[PDB]
Design a protein around this ligand. Structure first.
Ligand SMILES: NC(=O)c1ccc[n+]([C@@H]2O[C@H](COP(=O)([O-])OP(=O)(O)OC[C@H]3O[C@@H](n4cnc5c(N)ncnc54)[C@H](OP(=O)(O)O)[C@@H]3O)[C@@H](O)[C@H]2O)c1
Ligand SMILES: NC(=O)c1ccc[n+]([C@@H]2O[C@H](COP(=O)([O-])OP(=O)(O)OC[C@H]3O[C@@H](n4cnc5c(N)ncnc54)[C@H](OP(=O)(O)O)[C@@H]3O)[C@@H](O)[C@H]2O)c1
Ligand SMILES: O=C(N[C@@H]1[C@@H]2C[C@@H]3C[C@H]1C[C@@](O)(C3)C2)c1sc(OCCO)nc1C1CC1
Ligand SMILES: O=C(N[C@@H]1[C@@H]2C[C@@H]3C[C@H]1C[C@@](O)(C3)C2)c1sc(OCCO)nc1C1CC1
Lengths: 260, 266
């Protein structure tokens, strides 16, 4: 049902797109002939990503370098991005703060930074993006994890931020169905993905197989373009089957009649 | 399995205990002859809770007033509460920032304030309380909501803060089975509760049967004493069935052996 032309000429933002899945999303969007604006802290890496996007066929490709620790950089990034492109059809929220597999001890700092970067910024970006996405009946694409659905050791602050994305964006989505705002929200529930960052963090600790990042990137884009509520992507067919939650869906619907 | 004598002489903190579910939890604990230390911003209301705690039979009851927007207050509160009781057996995390029902718009202040008070303060309190809780092989009781498990409109920021509690404390729960820290974590998933705050917030916006705050409070204490992983409290016998997530537990156990804990356990 997905066709690459659905993204042609679309105005797309991708965060954390200097490397990993983000960069791969930018490359697929370029190939589909979208307009892209990518962001990360490293302007020099973003310059390379952008040049390759243009090689690949992007309608246009630009970059804004900065940290999503800074909420005012964040808020202003969306405005500057929309002015470059002359609007906004898709906002792909993918960036995270640097993290390792380690037991939580006494690390409020890391918890607080994970919440600011992986969560608050995403809300800030959404608030700034919303007027344009309302004008275009656009998409919000929230990149989460299986650790944002299920509990795993070694990723406590990370998991809090990802669970928070589910709670916020899923609730916003219900609100859109009651005020008929035509902005889709796609939560992307990802298993281990073979990015450089992940593969280095995981070596000698985890023995799960990673899924290829290029296909991951593509499945996220497909899901957003088709406006799916959630996208599941893992190297195991089993976990994919087990990730669904019909109980949650019934329960949510059981209370649809409760609001005047 | 539960006996009220399980709480007799136990050293228990209850936050957000000037009214509602927190207050009823304090009263229950008192009847059971526990030691309580209650907290909230309002010293006036707290003092009344404490008096009545003593009348009901607490081994001892004290209060400390302050705001959980203040992380140094949160941290210092736990130390002081411990001094008062001569230890800590149970940390009951119940407070939130005042919230009303509203569609989201632009309220980043409210989103931040919800994450700070409803979630981060809970992490700061846990960090302060862990040394006492490790020594007593104690319990952490996290008050959450059905909005912390499932999506409803009009509570985006609240829901975000409650969802964060699950991911954080459930992830730490897994960590305690690797480090073998004997601290239980009970996440209490509550439906609409007839507290004064909620009954006000809900009138003319939502039509849901509320459950009684007193029996809700007892159920949180039962669950915590019995060191249960989750407590479910709602007026519907349906929602209590639909709120369990067995495929989540399957996925958790299936991946629990995929780690090499050697470096973390040596
Ligand atoms: N890889 C996996 O196994 C896996 C599994 C499940 C879910 N996911 C999810 O997939 C998404 C991307 O993961 P990834 O593995 O592809 O990551 P990655 O390769 O480590 O890239 C992280 C991106 O975020 C940027 N970034 C880091 N800190 C930032 C900050 N403070 N402000 C702005 N940007 C910042 C990085 O660039 P700069 O350093 O230059 O800023 C980079 O472009 C994340 O949301 C993650 O939760 C990944
Ligand atoms: N009522 C429901 O329907 C319902 C449903 C599901 C879950 N819950 C959960 O149950 C728990 C208790 O709810 P409730 O309805 O019983 O609440 P409540 O009666 O309104 O009481 C809130 C408590 O928190 C205190 N508080 C507010 N702001 C504070 C701050 N910044 N620092 C410290 N304390 C603060 C209040 O006292 P001060 O203002 O004097 O500080 C009061 O003691 C919450 O975690 C809530 O999310 C409630
Ligand atoms: O988000 C994760 N991992 C991320 C990945 C690896 C670690 C933790 C975080 C954030 C990183 O930056 C570093 C990239 C995930 S997703 C997952 O599911 C396994 C089934 O495929 N497990 C994990 C953690 C390995 C348990
Ligand atoms: O936490 C809530 N409510 C809280 C309660 C009343 C409102 C919203 C929040 C926070 C309050 O302080 C204010 C107290 C809940 S729990 C629930 O489950 C449905 C079955 O009972 N629904 C809601 C909200 C009505 C959607």
């Amino acid at each position: 049902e997905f066709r690459p032309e659905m993204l042609q000429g679309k105005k797309v933002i991708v965060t954390g797109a200097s490397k990993g899945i983000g960069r791969e999303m930018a490359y697929h969007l370029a190939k589909m002939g979208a307009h892209v604006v990518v962001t990360a802290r490293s302007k020099e890496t973003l310059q390379k990503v952008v040049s390759h996007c243009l090689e690949l066929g992007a309608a246009s490709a630009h970059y804004i370098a900065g940290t999503m620790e800074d909420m005012t950089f964040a808020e202003q990034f969306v405005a500057q991005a929309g002015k470059l492109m002359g609007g906004l059809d898709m906002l792909i929220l993918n960036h995270i703060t640097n993290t390792s597999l380690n037991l939580f001890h006494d690390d409020i700092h890391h918890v607080r930074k994970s919440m600011e970067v992986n969560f608050l910024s995403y809300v800030v970006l959404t608030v700034a993006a919303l007027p344009m996405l309302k004008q275009s009946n656009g998409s919000i694409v929230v990149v989460s994890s299986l650790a944002g659905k299920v509990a795993y050791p070694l990723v406590a602050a990370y998991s809090a931020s990802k669970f928070a994305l589910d709670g916020f964006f899923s609730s916003i989505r219900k609100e859109y169905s009651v005020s008929r705002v035509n902005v889709s929200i796609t939560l992307c529930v990802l298993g281990l993905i073979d990015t450089e960052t992940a593969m280095k963090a995981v070596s000698g600790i985890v023995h799960m197989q990673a899924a290829p990042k290029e296909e991951c990137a593509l499945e996220i884009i497909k899901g957003g373009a088709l406006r799916q509520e959630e996208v599941y992507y893992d190297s195991s067919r089993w976990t994919t089957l087990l990730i669904r939650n019909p109980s949650r869906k019934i329960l949510e619907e059981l209370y649809s009649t409760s609001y005047n």
